[PDB]
Amino acid sequence: VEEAQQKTIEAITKAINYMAKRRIGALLTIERDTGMGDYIETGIPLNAKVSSELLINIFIPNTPLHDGAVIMKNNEIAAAACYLPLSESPFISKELGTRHRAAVGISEVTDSLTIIVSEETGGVSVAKNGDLHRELTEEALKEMLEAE
Amino acid sequence: PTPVEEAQQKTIEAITKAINYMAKRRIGALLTIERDTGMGDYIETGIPLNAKVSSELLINIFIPNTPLHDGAVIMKNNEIAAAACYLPLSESPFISKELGTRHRAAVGISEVTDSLTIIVSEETGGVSVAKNGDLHRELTEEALKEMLEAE
Numbered sequence: 001v002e003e004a005q006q007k008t009i010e011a012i013t014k015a016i017n018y019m020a021k022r023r024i025g026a027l028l029t030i031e032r033d034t035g036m037g038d039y040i041e042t043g044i045p046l047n048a049k050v051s052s053e054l055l056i057n058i059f060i061p062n063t064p065l066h067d068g069a070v071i072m073k074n075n076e077i078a079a080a081a082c083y084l085p086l087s088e089s090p091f092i093s094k095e096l097g098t099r100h101r102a103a104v105g106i107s108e109v110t111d112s113l114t115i116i117v118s119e120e121t122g123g124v125s126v127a128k129n130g131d132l133h134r135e136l137t138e139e140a141l142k143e144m145l146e147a148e
Numbered sequence: 149p150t151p152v153e154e155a156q157q158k159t160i161e162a163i164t165k166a167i168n169y170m171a172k173r174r175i176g177a178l179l180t181i182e183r184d185t186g187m188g189d190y191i192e193t194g195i196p197l198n199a200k201v202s203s204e205l206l207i208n209i210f211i212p213n214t215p216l217h218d219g220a221v222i223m224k225n226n227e228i229a230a231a232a233c234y235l236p237l238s239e240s241p242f243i244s245k246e247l248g249t250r251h252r253a254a255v256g257i258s259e260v261t262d263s264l265t266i267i268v269s270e271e272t273g274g275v276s277v278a279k280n281g282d283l284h285r286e287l288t289e290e291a292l293k294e295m296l297e298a299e
């Protein structure tokens with residue numbers, strides 16, 4: 001179980017690094033104790049093994065799966081192109097767009113952890129508990145995933 | 149129809165929609181459908197997906213210049229087993245000389261299995277199928293769907 005969790009963290013951070021460097025927008029939500037089946041059902045079902053390659057291919061711009069969220073559950077990619085609720089929080093930086101508001105929005109009604117890559121800057125952020133943690137390095141994201 | 153038959157129809161619809169989209173856009177593709185001869189040895193050379201089929205995922209896999217696009221997708225029933233898989237290259241002299249590695253790999257796997265492989269040419273957008281060592285070129289959408297339904 002521990003080896004599997006580490007393999008999944010490595011797959012995620014490799015995909016995030018690829019997308020950050022190319023400023024490919026991405027939205028990846030990891031289900032925790034709050035069930036997210038209602039959101040999973042809005043997307044395209046995958047129930048796929050995690051790999052950095054599949055995560056990258058999903059988010060390539062102008063492709064069927066790239067808009068909306070990937071939702072991971074039980075160490076698999078449950079679905080892609082999923083709807084998440086947009087936060088109305090007035091405390092999100094006004095320079096950020098829909099992916100960030102969707103990530104904060106799901107984080108207000110679940111215990112999930114969501115990773116966002118900005119298409120404008122390639123900056124990486126995480127939404128949890130209604131807050132957005134901006135300006136993350138790879139080491140910082142890894143620390144969050146291991147804590148989670 | 150039974151659930152198995154309905155699932156088969158959904159899988160055929162997903163495949164044909166994806167192939168049609170890729171053909172129109174000259175997106176090269178190589179898609180092998182396992183039949184009664186097991187293809188585990190080739191599946192194991194790729195990136196494991198074990199994913200539910202959708203036209204959307206098939207398209208996303210083959211987008212040029214992406215991690216998953218080079219090599220074969222291998223399907224088992226209603227699942228995409230793996231992407232970026234190796235297939236053996238045919239040496240058949242009945243492969244049109246202008247065709248490249250995707251068509252030769254398709255004919256190659258068809259010589260050692262009963263699988264059906266679909267190819268989209270990145271040069272012309274033409275759609276072909278390899279089966280039992282033969283390549284059938286320039287298929288219409290209707291002809292592909294009928295071949296899949298018969299398979």
Ligand SMILES: [C][C]N([C][C])[C][C]OC1=[C][C]=C([N+5](=O)=O)[C]=[C]1
Pocket residue numbers: 013014016017020021121122123124136137138139141142
């Ligand atoms: C200057 C920073 N920009 C270009 C390098 C984007 C940030 O670069 C990364 C941030 C986070 C991860 N990470 O969380 O894995 C990977 C790359």
Ligand SMILES: [Mg+2]
Pocket residue numbers: 061062066067
């Ligand atoms: Mg876009």
Ligand SMILES: [Mg+2]
Pocket residue numbers: 285286
């Ligand atoms: Mg002809």
